Symmetry: D2
Subunit: 106 residues, 4 copies
């Protein structure tokens, strides 16, 4: 659905990964994050409402999702390999991307 | 919207890139493809209708979109640098990904 | 060592993947390709000997190795998950990048 | 050459990026970092000397370099586009990867 709901599922599932005991829990959480990130692709954030869909800001905004999506992808492979700690570490590294976009556009 | 519509916009814009004379045309077409690929993320193809969203087939199906999205991302950077020929070559390389998914799931 | 030798190991191991019966064989081959691709990074091809290391051609040449390295990395994740067929398909998709560089610079 | 020398050039060039006033400076520094990261690929860190090259630790160590290499690649596209501030931000995000590997293996 909307940007806020997608952001909520990203946040909820990042916390799930942080507290996870097994690979299945991490895999499920990352799958849901992948779907939320993909669904958020086309959203226009409130702070960029006055800007063109083709503006440098909107391109940069969408670029952040490219980065997040790529990171979720790789973290899911690590989880699929049963590498819980490695996948959790990869999910922690996702935060740098979360935080970078929030700093600019939230 | 639906899978078929997203595939049409992928195909339309790939052709635009092949026939393009300037970077602006390639940039615009790749941007459209990126949106279409992200929107297609969550779709269930007709041939996998009987399968679980968590089946090996559906994970592999979605994985192909991860690959496509990554390739579109890189091609847009080359287009942004004004490297028309390089971006066109990158777009041609996308076809390997198109064809690979079609052969399995179309 | 030298570009030719790295290319030999890339080609040899690609063929090993094609003929492989299990994931261990694919994993081993892809690990060898990863090392060869990384070692090839800083090589200057005969056809670009007259060009500056900072030339558009040399940047483009190195870029092709980034692409190849990224694809080997993902294919190895698939092999690590025991997805032999998927990893073999991924390795087949590597050829598009092999061929693209050879057409321009070999 | 050796791991320590590669780390020095990574560190020196990261600082250059942080203090840079032009895209050319950032481009040059990122190119050097890419070469150093590629060269570090096959190194065995002192803390993993008693481990097999096929150990989980060595796989994870090498994985960190793939991640770094991917991020340097993206950052260089941004610099090539003349987006100094975006490239500098991308280089800052590299630190997350530097720091993550150091915490585990330094
Ligand atoms: C896993 C990574 C991420 C997490 C955990 C996350 C989490 C959140 C949370 C909890 C909110 C607040 C929702 C609310 O109550 O209003 C939010 C808002 C927001 N996020 Fe993220 N986020 C992530 C990645 C990103 C990325 C990559 C972008 C941009 C590329 C982004 C852009 C935004 C924007 C623009 C808002 C404000 C939404 C609004 O006001 O409607 N986020 N995020
Ligand atoms: C740029 C690359 C691609 C192009 C140019 C392309 C093009 C097309 C076209 C023209 C159609 C027929 C649409 C119609 O009239 O019904 C189609 C269908 C389809 N494509 Fe793609 N495609 C691409 C990428 C992909 C990828 C990466 C996947 C899988 C991950 C995929 C999966 C499918 C499926 C499952 C259908 C069947 C849709 C249906 O019958 O309802 N495509 N594609
Ligand atoms: C997995 C894919 C690849 C395969 C199977 C492959 C295989 C080969 C083979 C069989 C040769 C000729 C044999 C030799 O002289 O050693 C060669 C040479 C060469 N390759 Fe590739 N290669 C691959 C990837 C690449 C990529 C991505 C690039 C560009 C970035 C590239 C650039 C070159 C160049 C410039 C030569 C000529 C070197 C010379 O003759 O001194 N190759 N490779
Ligand atoms: C751009 C990111 C990075 C920067 C700026 C950086 C910088 C440094 C510096 C300044 C040192 C101390 C000098 C030395 O003794 O080598 C060092 C050491 C080291 N780094 Fe990094 N590094 C980065 C990335 C990484 C990554 C990704 C890994 C692992 C995947 C890693 C593993 C190590 C190890 C094992 C040492 C200790 C080796 C030794 O000195 O005996 N570094 N790094
Ligand atoms: Zn990975
Ligand atoms: Zn690129
Ligand atoms: Zn993958
Ligand atoms: Zn990018």
């Amino acid at each position: 659905a909307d940007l806020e709901d997608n952001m909520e599922t990203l946040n909820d599932n990042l916390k799930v990964i942080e507290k996870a005991d097994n690979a299945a829990q991490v895999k499920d959480a990352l799958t849901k994050m992948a779907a939320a990130a993909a669904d958020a692709w086309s959203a226009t954030p409130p702070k960029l409402e006055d800007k063109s869909p083709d503006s440098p800001e909107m391109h940069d905004f969408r670029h952040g999702f490219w980065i997040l999506i790529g990171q979720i992808h790789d973290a899911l492979h690590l989880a699929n390999e049963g590498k819980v700690k490695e996948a959790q570490a990869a999910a922690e590294q996702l935060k740098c991307t979360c935080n970078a976009c929030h700093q600019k556009y939230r």
